[PDB]
Design a protein around this ligand. Structure first.
Ligand SMILES: [Mg+2]
Ligand SMILES: [Mg+2]
Ligand SMILES: [Mg+2]
Ligand SMILES: [Mg+2]
Ligand SMILES: [Mg+2]
Ligand SMILES: [Mg+2]
Ligand SMILES: [Mg+2]
Ligand SMILES: [Mg+2]
Ligand SMILES: [Mg+2]
Ligand SMILES: [Mg+2]
Ligand SMILES: [Mg+2]
Ligand SMILES: [Mg+2]
Lengths: 148, 145, 70, 62, 143, 206
RNA sequence: AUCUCUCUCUAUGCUCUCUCUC
RNA sequence: UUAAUUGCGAUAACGAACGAGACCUUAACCUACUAAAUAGGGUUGCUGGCACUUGCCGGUUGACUCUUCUUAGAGGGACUAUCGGUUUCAAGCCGAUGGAAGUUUGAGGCAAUAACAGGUCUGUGAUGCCCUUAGACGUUCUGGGCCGCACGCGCGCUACACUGACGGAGCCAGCGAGUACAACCUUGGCCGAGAGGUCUGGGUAAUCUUGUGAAACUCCGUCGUGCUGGGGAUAGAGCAUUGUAAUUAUUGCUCUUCAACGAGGAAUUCCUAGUAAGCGCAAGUCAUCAGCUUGCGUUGAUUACGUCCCUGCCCUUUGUACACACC
């Protein structure tokens, strides 16, 4: 099985900007997978999904598609994500998108190696992406630096 | 019930009667993967052979496999009458046959060709790409080719 | 499950040494803790229960309820 | 934080959809307070009602 | 103090009877044992090759012991069940009609099941004795 | 304990003090510990039912639903989704199996564990679609006890159902595991997680 | 003197007609 | 207030009549009465088996004795009864006790006034009127056709599997329906591996089919996260059956063929207790065919006991440049 988080530490932080791929709509909002932090399930409570009343839910959010998001409530014990889409400021959105793209690129890098040789994925993650992140901030930046 | 652990003797994934026979399916249900071979009749064949059904696909020794093949290809001699096999009575020989793997399809094709030659309703339908056995195409068959 | 329907000797040994310490023994449990996956697990369980090893709680088939001796 | 109050009287039932009860909650820790609370579901007199909310109260539901 | 057939658990008893039958030489098996599906309302034939027909015979005997006037048709009705018509809702279809008859014939040959001059089959005294013996054996096995 | 002499054969267990103490099909209906204050006549306990299968009238009054044994209610809840509508015997069997599993794993009287799970899953603060014009506005409403209990039970069953949908794990074992998780230890069970999420949502709203 | 306090878009539509005897 | 123009009461209205209710029909309760080889017992004979000292389980139209269950018939039963409080203490309501039962005890069946330009002349010998009326739109025979298929909806069924499927083996139902001036429901015994044959009898009815030994379920297995033994559509080929006539598989049964289908978008139906759903069965159609309806009966949940937010409805007031009446 393939897993492990995008960033250095296991659990997300408060006011972290994420991109959320929509799985299914229930009652609170949607049990989305955060594509900036692992694949831990969380929800956008029906109040902070859009700035204005837009009536339609499956045209501005859409099942299967990605949404520009921010993490509101985090509980460092087991696994809960109270999430927002509205609290993301104008602009800022572009930055978030860029970050998401970077994350995706990073993910793409870390799977080919695994395919070539199996071996534990956590170990691979440790020896490729994390120290650099710790040194600076994000792995894509490190990659860019390396390229330069 | 078997307490026997078994060492490195059984080789999974077998090439039997041209079509690939996969691993660790329960002999009968391993044989079912081959066209012409079907569940109940496979079971019957196995019984005739006198191999225990509660065994692995790789487990089978070559002799047993050979016997099974023989039973399949020449069915009439081993007490398998009419309410048993594929082409009962038949149109070409008078004898009944339990067609297999790459034979049944060929036979079907031949039949279709003959129908086309002799312009029968069923044949016409087949040529068209339409439903034959009493169906109303008002709703039936919107998947197409 | 990626095959894993073999009563392998090493596997058997593993089962022998991993069924104690853990209180609950079942086919599902075995599948979970990566050894045998499916039909032959049941067989293994049966042949562990001849005299001792793991004590029965269940008087019912399909679902097995077994506890190791304390 | 954990609080719990016994119910004593029901102040009718309010809601656009309805169903949600308006209750008068009395605290078993100091009976000096009788507050108007929103309760979802079947509720009678003399029931211990756990409250995650401490002080916030609302009457009508619209 | 003693034992009878009704007071001993169903499946265990039946299996014991089957075992006894297997042990015994006389049975008069068909030339089509485990070649038939036992029911036309059934999809796949019985498992574990040897026996099963023995088990059915035992069950038939038990049924006969329980009632008085049971024929082939009634027995057939008793066995079988719902035939998977597939796409169409499953109607109750009776078992394979000849198999039951064959079983009855076999029993008659053994001398356990006889006929009554009203219609159908009833138990013989020897048969009853045998059943009682089997019950006793089952009891012994239990405690 | 005290064999009663009959012409008919009766098992030893029945003869023993099961005539004297009437608790379950060989389980303790005593202990009696509800972690929250009172909550009785909402979670039943007390009445020592032998097997969780009673045919009675528990919809024909407002609160009479409470006087259902908790195990029975669990069984009923399990009895859900197409393939299993009716067939309460199956449900009962599954419950028994679950109980056995609980007994095996981390010991204890399973009933108490069940009760704990029921207590610790169910939510204090809930959401209702009040509207504010029919739009996405949900005022935080606190839940009544019986309803809350019912909800908890349902979510527990739902968890089990979710687990079983294409898996090696037979329903009962999975159910037991999730119940244990709910009670205390990990809180990585589905139902409990859902409840917590709901509570969080309620908190962020009014 | 006891109120308590709720909320927004929504456009248009062409096919008849009927009395008695005092 | 009540399900109710249901009451109580205020009273230019008083006394009414429909409607509702009552009423019928059944479903529940009657160890009460009348009764019963066409319904079951009870004891004892007559035997069979195992314990054996009495016994348990049966079989048998042997007597005789009843009637609790099964049938019906007369009847009875609950009327909100009894308190507890609440309400101008009236009308009533919610809770508790007792009760077979307290939602009008559940469900029906009849359903007012007024209509609709609803539906039908394709139920009729119920018909006005117009037409065609002898190469006939009459009539019957032969053969198609309504069953065609690039598509779009509406019902329903089967599934998407472990509470599964597949084997065994447990074993339990209620409505029916069924022969004459014809060819019914079919038992029991032999054929066949199924379907279905076949000589016989029973039954034109509580008796015989049929205790409709029905499924789903119940227990022992086998399989085991796999579009895989889940799914059985589509195709072949063959054996019967009904019919004068089965090709455009009538159906059935055996075989092989194994697709779409990983619980379903926006949407929307149905349901508040023996109910929902699962599961059958019988009947209607029927020569043959149920995925259909109509009635039973098994299995039996979850959540409400409320509000008017959406969708309607009811009355009261209100405003209408609207009565083909907001389309
Ligand atoms: Mg009174
Ligand atoms: Mg009425
Ligand atoms: Mg006319
Ligand atoms: Mg002409
Ligand atoms: Mg038509
Ligand atoms: Mg319809
Ligand atoms: Mg199948
Ligand atoms: Mg199925
Ligand atoms: Mg009956
Ligand atoms: Mg398959
Ligand atoms: Mg037809
Ligand atoms: Mg208008």
């Amino acid at each position: 099985t393939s897993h492990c988080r995008f960033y250095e530490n296991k659990y997300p932080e408060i006011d972290d900007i994420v991109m959320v791929n929509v799985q299914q709509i229930a009652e609170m909002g949607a049990y989305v997978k955060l594509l900036e932090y692992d694949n831990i399930e969380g929800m956008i409570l029906l109040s902070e999904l859009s700035r204005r009343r837009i009536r339609s839910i499956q045209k501005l959010i859409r099942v299967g598609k990605n949404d520009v998001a921010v993490v509101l409530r985090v509980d460092k014990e087991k696994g809960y994500i109270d999430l927002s889409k509205r609290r993301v400021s104008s602009e800022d959105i572009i930055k978030c998108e860029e970050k998401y793209q970077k994350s995706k690129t990073v993910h793409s890098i870390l799977r080919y190696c695994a395919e070539k040789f199996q071996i534990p994925l956590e170990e691979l993650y440790k020896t490729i992406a994390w120290p650099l992140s710790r040194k600076f901030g994000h792995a894509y930046e490190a990659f860019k630096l390396s390229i330069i | 019930s078997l307490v026997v652990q078994e060492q490195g003797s059984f080789q999974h994934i077998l090439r039997l009667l041209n079509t690939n026979v996969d691993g660790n399916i329960n002999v009968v249900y391993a044989l079912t993967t081959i066209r012409g071979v079907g569940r109940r009749y496979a079971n019957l064949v196995c019984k005739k052979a006198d191999v225990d059904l509660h065994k692995r696909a790789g487990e089978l020794t070559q002799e047993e496999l050979e016997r099974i093949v023989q039973i399949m290809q020449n069915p009439t001699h081993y007490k398998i009458p009419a309410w048993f096999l594929n082409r009962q009575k038949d149109v070409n020989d008078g004898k009944d046959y339990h067609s297999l793997a790459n034979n049944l399809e060929s036979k079907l094709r031949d039949d279709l060709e003959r129908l086309k030659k002799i312009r029968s309703h069923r044949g016409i339908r087949h040529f068209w790409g339409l439903r034959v056995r009493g169906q109303h195409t008002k709703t039936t068959g919107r998947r197409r080719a | 499950a990626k095959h894993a329907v073999v009563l392998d000797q090493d596997k058997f040994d593993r089962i022998m040494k991993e069924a104690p310490t853990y209180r609950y023994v079942s086919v599902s449990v075995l599948v979970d803790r990566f050894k045998l996956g499916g039909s032959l697990a049941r067989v293994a369980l049966r042949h562990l229960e001849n005299e001792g090893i793991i004590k029965p709680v269940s008087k019912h088939s399909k679902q097995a309820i077994y506890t190791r001796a304390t | 934080p954990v609080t719990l109050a016994k119910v004593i009287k029901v102040l009718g039932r309010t809601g656009s959809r309805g169903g949600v009860t308006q209750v008068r909650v009395e605290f078993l820790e100091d009976t000096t307070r009788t507050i108007v609370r929103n309760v979802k579901g079947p509720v009678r007199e003399g029931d211990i009602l756990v409250l995650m909310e401490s002080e916030r109260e609302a009457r009508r539901l619209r | 103090p003693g034992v009878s057939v009704r007071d001993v658990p169903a499946q265990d008893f039946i299996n014991n009877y089957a075992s006894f039958l297997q042990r015994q030489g006389k049975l008069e098996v068909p030339g089509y044992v485990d070649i038939v599906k036992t029911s036309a309302g059934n999809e796949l034939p019985p498992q574990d090759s040897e026996g099963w027909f023995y088990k059915r015979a035992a069950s038939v005997a038990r049924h006969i012991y329980l009632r008085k006037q049971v024929g082939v048709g009634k027995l057939n009705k008793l066995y079988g069940g719902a035939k998977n018509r597939g796409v169409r809702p499953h109607k109750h279809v009776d078992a394979s009609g000849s198999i039951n008859r064959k079983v009855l014939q076999s029993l008659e040959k053994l001398g356990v099941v006889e006929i009554s001059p009203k219609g159908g089959r009833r138990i013989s005294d020897n048969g009853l004795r045998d059943l009682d013996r089997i019950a006793a054996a089952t009891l012994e096995d239990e405690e | 304990f005290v064999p009663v002499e009959l012409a008919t054969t009766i098992p030893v267990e029945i003869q023993q003090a099961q005539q004297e103490i009437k608790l379950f099909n060989k389980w303790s209906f005593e202990d009696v510990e509800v972690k929250d204050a009172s909550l009785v006549d909402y979670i039943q306990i007390s009445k020592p039912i032998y097997v969780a299968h009673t045919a009675g009238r528990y919809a024909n009054k407002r609160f009479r639903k409470a006087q259902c044994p908790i195990v029975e209610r669990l069984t009923n809840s399990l009895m859900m989704n197409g393939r299993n509508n009716g067939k309460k015997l199956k449900a009962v069997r599954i419950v028994k199996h679950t109980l056995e599993i609980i007994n095996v794993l981390t010991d204890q009287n399973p009933l108490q564990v069940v009760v704990d799970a029921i207590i610790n899953s169910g939510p204090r603060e809930d959401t209702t679609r009040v509207g504010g014009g029919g739009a996405a506005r949900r005022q935080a409403v606190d839940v009544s006890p019986l309803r809350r209990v019912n909800q908890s039970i349902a979510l527990l069953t739902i968890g089990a159902r979710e687990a079983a949908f294409r898996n090696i794990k037979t329903i009962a074992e999975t159910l037991a595991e999730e119940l244990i998780n709910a009670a205390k230890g990990s809180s990585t069970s589905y139902a409990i997680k859902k409840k917590d999420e709901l509570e969080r949502v309620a908190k962020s709203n009014r």
